[PDB]
Ligand binder design. Structure first.
Ligand code: CLA
Ligand code: CLA
Ligand code: CLA
Ligand code: CLA
Ligand code: CLA
Ligand code: CLA
Ligand code: CLA
Ligand code: CLA
Ligand SMILES: CCCCCCCCCCCCCCCC(=O)OC[C@H](COP(=O)(O)OC[C@@H](O)CO)OC(=O)CCCCCCCCCCCCCCC
Ligand SMILES: CC1=C(/C=C/C(C)=C/C=C/C(C)=C/C=C/C=C(C)/C=C/C=C(C)/C=C/C2=C(C)CCCC2(C)C)C(C)(C)CCC1
Ligand code: SF4
Ligand code: SF4
Ligand code: SF4
Lengths: 141, 139, 160, 80, 741, 68, 74
């Protein structure tokens, strides 16, 4: 239940720090906005917010939402890269547009890269995502 | 045998023969040229190929063939007639580089198979087969 | 006029510069105990050891842990004796391994044939021992007997 | 002395012999190649081990292969 | 003999080659099969000799690339003047230069970097700059920010003009080869026309602009009632009310009555007591004197009219018995090889930049330069680093000359041939003097560590212990302190307060003190000589053994930049001339780090500090160089541990970016050792393991991933090493001196 | 079945393109050990350090191959 | 001395005999209640010996002699 971690509003070390939060942007009340926004976290004896990473809810915003957001964005980047790499193979001049990127193909790969997990599941169930161990270069033992 | 040759006009350097040349072995290169030109010694600096036939001494075989490569390439008269010898301090001379009289990159009859394996390099025995013996897996 | 020539053989890796072999360095290197014509070993070693033992009582006598103490000259003598003994052990084992004929250069066209054998280098080592002990003791006696000798005040005021 | 071993996957391009700086290698006639020649290493006691012959070999794995073994005064390439 | 001849439109201006990378090399044009193509694209982009074999095309490329480099430098200079004009407190700094720090860069508040805007005075928040631009503009007579804005606009116009000239001299009218061979005309126009006319124009500016504006500034007039420099020329009455010898005209110049110009052309020598800089009358007189000397020197060489020298008979006549033939062949070397010219020019520019560093600290040329310790420390450190880099590049290009441009046919029995012939005697005696200097410069520190550790303070090499007083340098200091009035009878003071005299102090801080040299200075100067000598040993060994050695005799055919010849001959690793530059970069790092450490400790302990009202000087550290700069533990404790208390406690303050850069440089130094210690064959096999995992998911790249080459691995390692160490020392120095200075 | 232009997979373990598919440039009909010249899309490691080029063809035997 | 006050007395590993010490190092390394330059033990075998049953120096001496006999036996 994390009795050692108190909420930052009830913690009497966070309230001493929260007066002297510096402004980060040009907004004059940015320190006060940070102070009110970090009060819902858990603070230790230092008076600083802590993040609990075990997938629980009311602390899913620490890791689960940023983690799923990164997984979507990184899957977007990797899937668009893999799609471009596959698309530039079977047209007999691949190093030149590996080094000088074909922009009209890359734009069509990028803007249609939002549906990366559906295409990933389709290629996984279709077997066209993973190359079989026979048709692949392997170093000598 | 006895190496009839005159030395190129060289000013003398510090990269030449050391004490082991007169005690272990030294090497010589003799070459005939029909013109007088300037060459670079592996010893260091530049010397003069005088008209006629030349004899130089070096401490290593690699210095002699580094000179012989400079005699073959990079010269317009295209000197190939060079011979490389080894002189031991006893006095014995061994004629080394053009043994058949032809350069090794040109094939010649009378040369036998040395170091030739009638097997693929991947088809080599494992060292675990050849444990505790003098034989190594490339034999 | 080329004052820097070869030694007579250009393809040998050396040059006959004024410092190397001109007129005054061929002599005085051929006239040192090593490379002198008439000396035997245990005489070359005697001269070399005497010079070395005499010079080595300079950075031990006034430069040591005891140099502010009256035992300082005696400790410098003992340190010189110890260094001469270590160098004699080094010479003895160098000979006992087995020596070759010494390197002939432009400065020294003739090297001592008597130092090309193990027996000659043993005589050289014994002469070095006796010479080093004698030179160290002579320098100790000279530095100690006036008990101040203000030449030692020079280069100890420098090495304060 | 090093061991320069020439294997039977040799196309006889003579690049190893021209790349060799101490005349270790030469060409011998050979019936098992299109070029009619294979490399041989007779005076392999002069091999320093620079592997310039292994650098110049155009086979997928090298038909000429240098094994660094016992070190002599010629394998070290010492002028002294 | 010297005429202008060009080719009209030799290279068309088209964008078709912009989209074809690797066009300059034949090997780079086949296409990127491996990732080594990408690194070879940048490694050989500027190597114009490997691109074309014609020296005329190479010289044309070099001449047109110089204009692009000058355009880049002019964009940089215009950016600095624009930052002074728009984002600086220069107008605030001119009012109160003793309590307002120079700042010329504000930081945008998007994250918590708004703390990086230091409170420097005058209601301005920004980064305290240490470049010395503010003192330079005060010495230039710049009073308002509009004069900086005009100079920034002029810098942009000049940068565009240089870009247009670079396009013009490669695509419209490109000079021939013999337009470059006549170095006689080039050197005459660089001595008289560039250095001579440039210093004459600056002497005229310092007469007409810098001197009256700076005399009114030192007299106590606020800069916005100070008249603009153009009514000093338009109205000579205001110019002649101060320094009243402008009442008479230019005729005493032409009747050789130069003495009446002595009020504004002085030879005072010392520092200005008001500002702490050199007298601007001394600088104007200096620029006039060297302008006349450079213009005279620019009439030495024969160009078109018979009078002059040809720089060949000078070389032909210089020959002795120890050399024989002499300098014959050197004119052809320096007129056919660009690399020999770069090796000479880069060495002299590096030693020149080191001279600039060693001179501007002792004789500060600018008002309030010595007062701001951060500016002085930063310009000294920056110019040492630039100078050492240029010296190592000179060693590099000498090595590139020896295998790519040296011809043994033109060099028989001259100086270069004989240097190659006794290179063993050169390198072995240099090796001996490096070993001797290492023992008798570092073993003194080791002995001092040992006797200070063993409780033997009387057995050390100290001022209280066995002394090692530098009697020659102290004698030279005594000669310079007594030089004014005895050997320089018309100097008011010495050239610098370093050699003697009194404490020159401005405000409450010391401008300069006498710098007494003791045992610690002797020992650290011998370490300076040692490290310089080892850098010379590595670079000169790379130069002399560039073509051949006893190990690899056929090393010129391998090239300047090759990794090795193989594991044979014991292993011929790092035999090339490039790898000696690679090691000499580490040794210049070591050398110049010890130089700037000696500077940053000696000036902080014995020169810099505050002046008590009694008259004594309380220094920054407290004069601990006499007793702690003799031990490595003293250098670790009283210099590195003690003075880095500012860079590590800088977090949450205005200098926290320096602590960030301190840690970042530590990271990059540690990151360098992955490339420096490891080798290519590990990483190629690791990339082979990664390629299979890409092949498993159809992620095989067309350009096959290779590990970095051995030379590129060494280059990446040494660049990261130098970057991480230099950033660390920059951060440590600047955060220390922005807290204690 | 081995003919010029046929795509074929390498069975030499030590080859760079082990279990990789390349085309046939020429097959030699004389009695030599490795008659099938096979050219690949990728390039070998071969070359000096820093060399951007490499070989992409080699001779192979009949038993060292399989037709796809 | 250490078994009387294990929390205050510093354990001594061995004595120092150095010809290179000055007076300052002899005075500095004369520690842990000794009259000689000694080294302070940081391996902590003193705690081990006190725990396993060693009380006096004779029980350590007989253990050292027994270990010498065991090493000779091996
Ligand atoms: C299409 C691009 C792409 C894809 C999807 C992959 C995917 C893979 N890589 Mg990666 N990688 C790539 C490019 C790519 N990489 C590049 C450019 C580099 C060189 C820096 C590497 C070097 C590399 C290493 C060293 C390792 C991986 C690993 C892996 C695996 C785990 C993911 C990971 O660790 O990411 C790590 C990703 C990086 C370190 C760099 C990725 C760079 C960007 C994000 C790639 C996408 C941008 C691309 C340049 C342009 C897209 C094309 C566009 C024009 C449409 C996974 C199979 C690991 C593995 O084998 O796990 C099984 C492994 O150890 N990769
Ligand atoms: C660390 C260096 C060192 C030191 C401090 C000294 C110091 C000493 N030497 Mg010595 N010496 C040195 C190196 C050294 N030596 C070397 C390198 C040589 C060879 C050139 C000599 C050759 C030498 C001779 C020939 C003599 C000295 C003598 C002296 C003593 C008086 C010096 C003198 O006359 O000054 C003024 C003093 C004990 C004298 C001596 O030992 O008499 C007792 C003397 O006669 N030394
Ligand atoms: C990486 C390159 C680099 C960088 C970024 C800078 C940057 C800096 N330099 Mg620097 N410099 C360098 C290389 C570098 N320099 C080199 C290679 C030299 C040797 C020529 C110098 C010599 C130099 C001097 C002498 C001074 C600067 C100063 C400055 C600072 C202000 C810039 C300015 O406007 O000064 C403007 C300064 C001037 C216009 C005076 C320079 C006039 C010189 C004496 C004439 C040189 C003529 C010619 C170009 C060189 C010919 C060489 C000859 C042997 C043939 C700044 C920190 C100044 C400074 O520290 O002020 C606080 C300063 O006075 N630098
Ligand atoms: C008085 C005559 C004169 C002047 C002003 C200069 C000045 C210069 N020349 Mg030039 N040159 C001249 C005549 C002149 N040259 C002659 C007659 C020859 C032909 C033999 C050369 C051939 C020559 C070469 C081939 C090179 C130079 C370069 C340089 C530049 C040195 C870089 C520098 O520090 O710039 C600082 C000084 C300024 C920016 C002031 C500019 C003054 C303007 C032009 C008036 C500088 C612009 C080098 C360069 O950088 O190329 C661009 C170079 O590559 N010049
Ligand atoms: C290249 C540099 C240069 C340039 C262009 C100038 C420019 C000029 N000088 Mg000069 N001046 C210079 C170098 C320079 N000077 C130096 C080096 C000296 C020292 C010998 C002087 C000493 C000087 C005096 C003594 C006077 C001039 C004056 C003049 C002006 C001529 C008369 C006039 O226009 O009214 C003119 C502004 C006269 C003037 O009008 O001053 C405002 C004036 O009386 N000059
Ligand atoms: C101690 C060294 C030394 C010696 C012996 C010489 C000897 C020579 N120089 Mg000189 N010179 C030297 C150093 C020296 N120089 C230096 C350091 C410089 C560069 C600053 C010059 C610059 C120089 C030039 C420009 C010329 C000579 C020339 C001469 C010759 C005639 C003597 C004369 O009038 O000038 C004596 C000058 C000095 C002693 C100074 C003679 C071969 C001339 C020549 O080429 O003759 C064939 C000539 O044109 N010299
Ligand atoms: C007037 C100056 C001058 C000139 C123009 C030359 C000219 C040249 N040099 Mg160089 N050189 C010099 C100074 C000079 N150099 C100095 C100062 C060094 C000492 C380090 C050397 C050392 C040297 C060597 C060792 C070699 C050359 C070579 C080259 C040639 C091609 C350069 C190239 O394409 O590489 C372009 C490569 C780069 C631009 C990469 C540089 C990467 C640096 C480390 C980054 C810059 C530092 C920066 C502040 C880091 C910021 C990090 C941040 C972005 C995160 C060309 C002849 C090469 C040659 O001729 O090959 C045969 C060669 O190998 N140079
Ligand atoms: C602290 C680090 C360190 C040390 C000790 C050395 C040591 C050495 N470097 Mg350097 N170097 C280093 C790091 C180091 N380097 C790294 C990082 C690189 C950069 C890549 C290299 C690369 C390098 C090159 C490229 C070169 C050297 C050379 C040298 C030598 C200079 C000669 C000298 O000073 O002799 C004196 C020795 C010292 C000052 C070391 C301290 C020894 C003390 C003073 C004496 C103690 C001995 C002791 C009493 C013996 C008795 C003990 C007994 C039990 C055995 C020396 C052996 C140069 C060389 O060999 O030519 C001369 C040279 O060419 N260095
Ligand atoms: C100033 C440098 C001192 C140079 C020694 C002068 C002596 C000198 O100039 O000799 C004079 C001699 C000049 O010979 P020539 O009369 O042939 O010279 C004609 C010249 O005009 C060149 O053609 O030079 C040599 O022979 C080179 C030998 C140097 C060998 C000595 C090594 C010097 C390096 C070590 C000494 C360093 C001391 C450095 C102190 C800063
Ligand atoms: C000349 C010359 C030189 C040299 C110098 C020197 C180096 C010197 C040294 C010197 C020395 C270094 C000396 C020494 C001396 C020694 C001696 C003098 C010894 C003696 C001894 C003795 C006599 C002893 C005895 C004894 C004995 C034997 C035993 C018993 C005891 C006794 C002790 C008695 C030079 C090079 C510059 C060059 C020029 C010239
Ligand atoms: S390793 Fe070098 S010397 Fe030996 S055979 Fe190969 S190329 Fe010749
Ligand atoms: S380099 Fe290799 S393939 Fe070419 S001839 Fe020599 S061994 Fe045969
Ligand atoms: S380890 Fe690398 S640099 Fe050294 S010899 Fe082998 S390949 Fe060359």
């Amino acid at each position: 239940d994390l009795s050692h971690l108190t909420p930052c509003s009830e913690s009497p070390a966070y309230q001493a720090k929260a007066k002297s939060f510096r402004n980060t942007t040009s907004d004059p009340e940015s320190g006060q906005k940070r102070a009110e926004s970090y009060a819902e976290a858990l603070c230790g004896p230092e008076g600083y917010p802590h993040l609990v990473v075990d997938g629980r809810l009311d602390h899913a915003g620490d890791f689960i939402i940023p983690g799923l957001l990164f997984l979507y964005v990184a899957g977007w980047i990797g899937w668009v890269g893999r799609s471009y790499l596959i698309a530039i193979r079977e047209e007999k001049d691949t190093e030149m547009k590996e080094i000088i990127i074909d922009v009209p193909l890359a734009i069509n790969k990028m803007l249609f890269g939002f549906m990366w997990p559906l295409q990933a599941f389709g290629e996984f169930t279709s077997g066209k995502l993973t190359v079989k161990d026979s048709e692949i270069p392997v170093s000598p033992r | 045998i006895q190496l009839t040759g005159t030395m190129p006009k060289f000013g003398g350097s510090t990269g030449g023969l050391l004490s082991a040349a007169d005690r272990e072995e030294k090497y010589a290169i003799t070459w005939t040229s029909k013109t007088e030109q300037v060459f670079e010694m592996p010893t260091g600096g530049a010397a003069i190929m005088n008209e006629g036939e030349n004899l130089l001494y070096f401490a290593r075989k690699e210095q002699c063939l580094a000179l012989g490569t400079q005699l073959r390439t990079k010269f317009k008269p295209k000197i190939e007639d060079y011979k490389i010898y080894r002189i031991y301090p006893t006095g014995e001379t061994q004629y080394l580089h053009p043994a058949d009289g032809v350069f090794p990159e040109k094939v010649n009859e009378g040369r036998e198979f040395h170091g030739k394996k009638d097997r693929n390099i991947g088809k080599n025995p494992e060292p675990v087969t050849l444990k505790f013996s003098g034989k190594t897996p490339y034999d | 006029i080329d004052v820097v020539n070869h030694g007579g053989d250009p393809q040998v890796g050396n040059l006959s510069t004024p410092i190397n072999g001109s007129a005054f360095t061929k002599a005085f290197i051929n006239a040192l105990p090593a490379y002198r014509k008439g000396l035997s070993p245990n005489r070359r070693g005697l001269e070399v050891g005497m010079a070395h033992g005499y010079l080595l009582y300079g950075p031990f006598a006034v430069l040591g842990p005891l140099r502010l103490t009256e035992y300082g000259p005696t400790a410098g003598l003992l340190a010189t004796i110890g260094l001469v003994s270590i160098l004699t052990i080094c010479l003895s084992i160098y000979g006992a391994v087995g020596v070759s004929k010494p390197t002939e250069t432009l400065t020294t066209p003739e090297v001592p044939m008597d130092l090309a054998t193990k027996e000659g280098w043993s005589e050289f080592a014994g002469g070095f021992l006796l010479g080093g002990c004698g030179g160290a003791f002579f320098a100790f006696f000279l530095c100690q007997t006036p008990h101040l000798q203000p030449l030692i005040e020079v280069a100890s005021n420098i090495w304060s | 002395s090093h061991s320069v071993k020439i294997y039977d996957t040799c196309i006889g391009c003579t690049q190893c012999v021209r790349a060799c700086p101490l005349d270790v290698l030469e060409m011998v006639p050979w019936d098992g190649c299109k070029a009619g020649q294979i490399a041989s290493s007779p005076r392999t006691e002069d091999c320093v081990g620079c592997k310039r012959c292994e650098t110049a070999c155009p086979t997928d794995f090298l038909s000429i292969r240098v094994y660094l073994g016992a070190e002599t005064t010629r394998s070290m390439g010492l002028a002294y | 003999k010297a005429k202008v001849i060009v080719d009209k439109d030799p290279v068309p201006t088209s964008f078709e080659k912009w989209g074809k990378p690797g066009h300059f090399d034949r090997t780079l044009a086949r296409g990127p099969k491996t990732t080594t193509w990408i690194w070879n694209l940048h490694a050989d982009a500027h190597d114009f000799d490997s691109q074309t074999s014609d020296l005329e095309d190479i010289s044309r490329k070099i001449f047109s690339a110089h204009f692009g480099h000058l355009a880049v430098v002019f964009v940089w200079l215009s950016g600095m003047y624009f930052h002074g004009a728009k984002f600086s407190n220069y107008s605030a700094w001119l009012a109160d230069p003793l309590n307002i720090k120079p700042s010329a860069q504000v930081v945008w508040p998007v994250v918590g970097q708004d703390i990086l805007n230091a409170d420097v005075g005058g209601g301005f928040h920004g980064i305290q700059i240490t470049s010395g631009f503010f003192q330079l503009w005060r010495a230039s007579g710049i009073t308002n920010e509009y004069q900086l804005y005009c100079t920034a606009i002029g810098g942009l116009v000049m940068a565009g003009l240089m870009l247009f000239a670079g396009w013009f001299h490669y695509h419209k009218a490109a000079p021939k080869l013999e337009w470059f061979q006549n170095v006689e005309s080039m050197m005459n126009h660089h001595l008289a026309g560039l250095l001579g006319l440039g210093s004459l124009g600056w002497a005229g500016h310092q007469i007409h602009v810098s001197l009256p504006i700076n005399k009114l500034l030192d007299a106590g007039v606020a800069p916005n009632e100070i008249p603009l420099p153009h009514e000093f020329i338009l109205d000579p009455a205001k110019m002649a009310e101060l320094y009243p010898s402008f009442a008479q005209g230019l005729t005493p110049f032409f009747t050789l009555n130069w003495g009446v110009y002595s009020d504004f052309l002085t030879f005072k020598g010392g520092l200005n007591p008001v500002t702490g800089g050199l007298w601007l009358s001394d600088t104007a007189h200096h620029h006039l004197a060297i302008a006349v000397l450079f213009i005279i020197a620019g009439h030495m060489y024969r160009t078109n009219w018979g009078i002059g020298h040809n720089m060949k008979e000078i070389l032909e006549g210089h020959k002795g018995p120890f050399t024989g033939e002499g300098h014959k062949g050197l004119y052809e070397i320096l007129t056919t090889s660009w690399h020999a010219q770069l090796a000479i020019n880069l060495a002299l520019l590096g030693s020149l930049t080191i001279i600039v560093a060693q001179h501007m600290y002792a004789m500060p040329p600018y008002p309030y330069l010595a007062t701001d310790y951060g500016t002085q420390l930063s310009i000294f450190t920056h110019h040492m680093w630039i100078g050492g880099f240029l010296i190592v590049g000179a060693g590099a290009h000498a090595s590139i000359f020896m295998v790519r441009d040296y011809d043994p046919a033109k060099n028989v029995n001259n100086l270069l041939d004989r240097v190659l012939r006794h290179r063993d005697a050169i390198i072995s005696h240099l090796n001996w003097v490096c070993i001797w200097l290492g023992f008798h410069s570092f073993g003194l520190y080791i002995h001092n560590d040992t006797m200070r550790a063993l409780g033997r303070p009387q057995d050390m090499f100290s001022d209280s212990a066995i002394q090692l007083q530098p009697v020659f340098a102290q004698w030279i200091q005594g000669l310079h302190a007594a030089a004014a009035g005895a050997t320089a009878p018309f100097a008011s003071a010495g050239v610098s307060p370093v050699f003697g005299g009194e404490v020159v102090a401005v405000g409450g801080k010391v401008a300069m003190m006498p710098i007494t040299l003791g045992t610690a200075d002797f020992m650290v100067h011998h370490i300076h000589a040692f490290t310089i000598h080892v850098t010379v040993l590595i670079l000169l060994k790379g130069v002399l053994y560039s073509r051949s050695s006893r190990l690899i005799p056929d090393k010129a055919e391998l090239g300047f930049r090759f990794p090795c010849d193989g594991p044979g001959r014991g292993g011929t690793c790092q035999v090339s001339g490039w790898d000696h530059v690679f090691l000499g970069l580490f040794w210049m790092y070591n050398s110049l780090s010890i130089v700037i450490f000696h500077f940053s400790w000696k000036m902080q302990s014995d020169v810099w500090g505050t002046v008590l009202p009694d008259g004594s000087v309380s220094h920054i550290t407290g004069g601990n160089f006499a007793q702690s700069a003799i031990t490595i533990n003293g250098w670790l404790r009283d210099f590195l541990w003690a003075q880095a208390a500012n860079v590590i406690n800088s977090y949450g303050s205005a200098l926290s970016a320096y602590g960030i850069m301190f840690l970042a440089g530590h990271f990059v130094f540690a990151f360098s050792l992955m490339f420096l210690f490891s080798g290519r064959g590990y990483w190629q096999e690791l990339i082979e393991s990664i390629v299979w995992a890409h092949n498993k998911l159809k992620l095989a790249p067309a350009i096959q991933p290779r590990a970095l080459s051995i030379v590129q691995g060494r280059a990446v390692g040494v660049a990261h090493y130098l970057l991480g160490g230099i950033v660390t020392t920059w951060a440590f120095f600047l955060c220390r001196i922005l807290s204690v200075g | 079945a081995i003919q010029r232009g046929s795509k074929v997979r390498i069975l030499r373990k030590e080859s760079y393109w082990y279990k990789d598919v390349g085309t046939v440039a020429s097959v030699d009909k004389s009695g030599i050990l490795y008659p099938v010249i096979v050219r690949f899309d990728k390039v070998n490691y071969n070359g000096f350090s820093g060399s951007a080029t490499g070989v992409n063809t080699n001779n192979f035997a009949e038993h060292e191959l399989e037709e796809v | 001395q250490w078994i009387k006050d294990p929390l205050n007395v510093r354990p001594i590993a061995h004595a120092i005999w150095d010809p290179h010490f000055g007076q300052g190092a002899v005075d500095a390394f004369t520690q842990a209640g000794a009259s000689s330059p000694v080294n302070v033990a940081y391996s902590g075998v003193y705690h081990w010996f006190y725990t396993i049953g060693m009380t006096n120096n004779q029980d350590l001496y007989q253990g050292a002699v027994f270990l010498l006999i065991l090493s000779a036996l091996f």
